Amino acid sequence: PFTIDSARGIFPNTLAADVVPATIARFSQLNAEDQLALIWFAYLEMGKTLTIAAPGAASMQLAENALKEIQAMGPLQQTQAMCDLANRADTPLCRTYASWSPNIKLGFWYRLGELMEQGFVAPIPAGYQLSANANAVLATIQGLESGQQITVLRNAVVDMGFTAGKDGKRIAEPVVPPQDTASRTKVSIEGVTNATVLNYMDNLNANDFDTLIELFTSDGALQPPFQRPIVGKENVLRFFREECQNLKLIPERGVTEPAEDGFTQIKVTGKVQTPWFGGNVGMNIAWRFLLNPEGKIFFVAIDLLASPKELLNF
Ligand SMILES: CC1=C(/C=C/C(C)=C/C=C/C(C)=C/C=C/C=C(C)/C=C/C=C(C)/C=C/C2=C(C)C(=O)CCC2(C)C)C(C)(C)CCC1=O
Ligand SMILES: [Cl-]
């Protein structure tokens, strides 16, 4: 209850799926052309059983100029551009890409994937064989749960491009209006009646970010899977609006314990669906909340769990 960074240690029994950042770190080592081929291979294979939702209209408009620029290039330059992104080279295209929210980056690649499939953008060379390191990276990915697989792909997409500057322009999709109060569902969590936790889940499921942020302490933080804590209301609200639209949180069960100085720690496990996959992928998630004496959120971590055996009382 003293520092955000120390709160990261609550519920240390929770086995997170650290194969995901392990696998990203291996992937990130690879030659850029192998990075692109590996993801193309993983995307095609995944596409046999799992269809990516179409990118939204707003997102596509925001990426349109950059997409058109690539499509207008000669094939060799197309491949160079894609390699630039994967290598995190400093180019205008890479800087533009880095200004984008994850969803806009994902929609940019969705479009390129389609164009590569159709042959209008330079495809991976015919009969391309992955490097030794890359083949093993792909094998690891394909052995993971689908929730882990899609998190690897997202993290690979988000990592591309080049950031120059701390206060650079941030482009995101427009913010959706909150769900009308009448049509809102309420979660039920075995063992957990805590109104802060329940309001957290319900407000996020309604896209009600302005209500959600009011649950947090001024200095409070939210820690997304495999990322550092996002600290303070401005940054946490920004993150909700840019990256947390249209989720479906399906918490199942939890456990509630005292913490130092009148705090309460609560762990919840359940599933989450992203709008990119809907009900076809349920990620196994834990939430770990540290609530202050008045019930506001000082810290919440969201963990992708190593396996379903990590869900409480499987
Ligand atoms: C790149 C590339 C390609 C294309 C690749 C493509 C098109 C790839 C597309 C990949 C896609 C669309 C991946 C989407 C992943 C989304 C996830 C993991 C969302 C998780 C959300 C969670 C857990 C949120 C949970 C949360 C909860 C519960 C909270 O309580 C608080 C909020 C928080 C957010 C933390 C080609 C195929 C063209 C080949 C070349 C190439 O390189
Ligand atoms: Cl998402």
Curated annotation (Swiss-Prot):
<dbReference type="InterPro" id="IPR032710">
    <property type="entry name" value="NTF2-like_dom_sf"/>
</dbReference>
<feature type="binding site" description="only in form OCP">
    <location>
        <begin position="272"/>
        <end position="283"/>
    </location>
    <ligand>
        <name>echinenone</name>
    </ligand>
</feature>
<keyword id="KW-0472">Membrane</keyword>
<dbReference type="GO" id="GO:0031404">
    <property type="term" value="F:chloride ion binding"/>
</dbReference>
<feature type="binding site" description="only in form OCP">
    <location>
        <begin position="244"/>
        <end position="249"/>
    </location>
    <ligand>
        <name>echinenone</name>
    </ligand>
</feature>
<comment type="similarity">
    <text>Belongs to the orange carotenoid-binding protein family.</text>
</comment>
<dbReference type="GO" id="GO:0031676">
    <property type="term" value="C:plasma membrane-derived thylakoid membrane"/>
</dbReference>
<protein>
    <recommendedName>
        <fullName>Orange carotenoid-binding protein</fullName>
    </recommendedName>
</protein>
<feature type="binding site" description="only in form RCP">
    <location>
        <begin position="33"/>
        <end position="37"/>
    </location>
    <ligand>
        <name>echinenone</name>
    </ligand>
</feature>
<feature type="binding site" description="residues alter contact in forms OCP and RCP">
    <location>
        <begin position="150"/>
        <end position="160"/>
    </location>
    <ligand>
        <name>echinenone</name>
    </ligand>
</feature>
<feature type="binding site" description="only in form OCP">
    <location>
        <position position="200"/>
    </location>
    <ligand>
        <name>echinenone</name>
    </ligand>
</feature>
<dbReference type="GO" id="GO:0009881">
    <property type="term" value="F:photoreceptor activity"/>
</dbReference>
<keyword id="KW-0793">Thylakoid</keyword>
<keyword id="KW-0716">Sensory transduction</keyword>
<comment type="subunit">
    <text>Monomer. Interacts with the APC core of the phycobilisome (PB), probably at a ratio of 1:1 in a light-independent manner; possibly only OCP-R binds to PBs. Interacts with FRP. Detachment from PBs is accelerated by FPR.</text>
</comment>
<dbReference type="InterPro" id="IPR002075">
    <property type="entry name" value="NTF2_dom"/>
</dbReference>
<feature type="binding site" description="only in form RCP">
    <location>
        <begin position="79"/>
        <end position="82"/>
    </location>
    <ligand>
        <name>echinenone</name>
    </ligand>
</feature>
<dbReference type="Pfam" id="PF02136">
    <property type="entry name" value="NTF2"/>
</dbReference>
<keyword id="KW-0157">Chromophore</keyword>
<dbReference type="InterPro" id="IPR015233">
    <property type="entry name" value="Orange_carotenoid-bd_N"/>
</dbReference>
<keyword id="KW-0605">Phycobilisome</keyword>
<feature type="binding site" description="only in form OCP">
    <location>
        <position position="287"/>
    </location>
    <ligand>
        <name>echinenone</name>
    </ligand>
</feature>
<feature type="binding site" description="in forms OCP and RCP">
    <location>
        <begin position="36"/>
        <end position="43"/>
    </location>
    <ligand>
        <name>echinenone</name>
    </ligand>
</feature>
<feature type="binding site" description="only in form RCP">
    <location>
        <begin position="124"/>
        <end position="128"/>
    </location>
    <ligand>
        <name>echinenone</name>
    </ligand>
</feature>
<keyword id="KW-0675">Receptor</keyword>
<feature type="binding site" description="in forms OCP and RCP">
    <location>
        <begin position="106"/>
        <end position="116"/>
    </location>
    <ligand>
        <name>echinenone</name>
    </ligand>
</feature>
<feature type="domain" description="OCP N-terminal">
    <location>
        <begin position="17"/>
        <end position="168"/>
    </location>
</feature>
<dbReference type="InterPro" id="IPR036917">
    <property type="entry name" value="Orange_carotenoid-bd_N_sf"/>
</dbReference>
<dbReference type="GO" id="GO:0030089">
    <property type="term" value="C:phycobilisome"/>
</dbReference>
<dbReference type="Pfam" id="PF09150">
    <property type="entry name" value="Carot_N"/>
</dbReference>
<dbReference type="GO" id="GO:0016037">
    <property type="term" value="P:light absorption"/>
</dbReference>
<comment type="function">
    <text>Acts as a blue-light photoreceptor and photo-protectant. Essential for inhibiting damaged induced by excess blue-green light via a process known as non-photochemical quenching (NPQ). In the dark or dim light the stable inactive form (OCP-O) is orange, upon illumination with blue-green light it converts to a metastable active red form (OCP-R), inducing energy dissipation, quenching cellular fluorescence via NPQ. One OCP-R molecule is sufficient to quench 1 phycobilisome. More OCP-R accumulates under high-light and low temperature; in the dark OCP-R spontaneously reverts to OCP-O.</text>
</comment>
<keyword id="KW-0600">Photoreceptor protein</keyword>
<keyword id="KW-0042">Antenna complex</keyword>
